[PDB]
């Protein structure tokens, strides 16, 4: 194809492109409002935390750093947010 509309890229393909190769650079990560079952307080954790984080009171662990997105502990309620 020759005629495209790079001014108005469709969102289905815009999320496909690499984070830097998009029309306007935008990250793929986000933040969380995680609540472990042992406690009630809400902590803000990063999608790709890359460092082990503990709940208040040394209740339990929340995240395991991996190659990509951190592995959330099963049983903890998390709500993705955005600004």
């Amino acid at each position: 194809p020759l005629a495209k509309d790079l001014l108005h890229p469709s969102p289905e393909e815009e999320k496909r492109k690499h984070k830097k190769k998009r029309l306007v650079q935008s990250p793929n990560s986000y933040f969380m409002d995680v609540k472990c079952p042992g406690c009630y307080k809400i902590t803000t954790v990063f999608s790709h935390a890359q460092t082990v984080v503990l709940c208040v009171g040394c209740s339990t662990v929340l995240c395991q750093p991996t190659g990509g997105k951190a592995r959330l502990t099963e049983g903890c309620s998390f709500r993705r947010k955005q600004h």
Binding site: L2, A3, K4, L6, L7, L23, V24, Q25
Partner: protein, 129 residues
């Protein structure tokens, strides 16, 4: 690395014209580029272009017509007198009827004929026909 930024912009829109794209995207936007595109737009060689100004070196999407033969860039930016400007457009432009040599002067960035009217030379940027 990317030394000359105007060179990457012109070669891209020159490649996309030979292929026949309707509008081309150039990755870095500099002040000299947008000043260069307007000299081409004021002569009808390109279409309406737009600057996607993010918080970095922005991107430009230039609507392309079928009117551009070649838009080269002369590197380095040689100094041009008004005495040798005729000799440049003698071996850089296709004919004496059309084609323009874009060169920057203290008065700004304009083609070689406006540099004749304002009677001042300067560094040469590129050429388009």
């Amino acid at each position: 690395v990317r030394m000359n930024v105007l060179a990457d912009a012109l070669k891209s829109i020159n490649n996309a014209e030979k292929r026949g794209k309707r509008q081309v995207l150039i990755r870095p936007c500099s002040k000299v580029i947008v000043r260069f595109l307007t000299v081409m737009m004021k002569h009808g060689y390109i279409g309406e272009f737009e600057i996607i100004d993010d918080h970095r070196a922005g991107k430009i999407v230039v609507n392309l017509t079928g009117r551009l033969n070649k838009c080269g860039v002369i590197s380095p930016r040689f100094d041009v007198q008004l005495k040798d400007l005729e000799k440049w457009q003698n071996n850089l432009l296709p004919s004496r009827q059309f084609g323009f040599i874009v060169l920057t002067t203290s008065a700004g960035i304009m083609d070689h004929e406006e540099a004749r009217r304002k009677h001042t030379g300067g560094k040469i940027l590129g050429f388009f026909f």
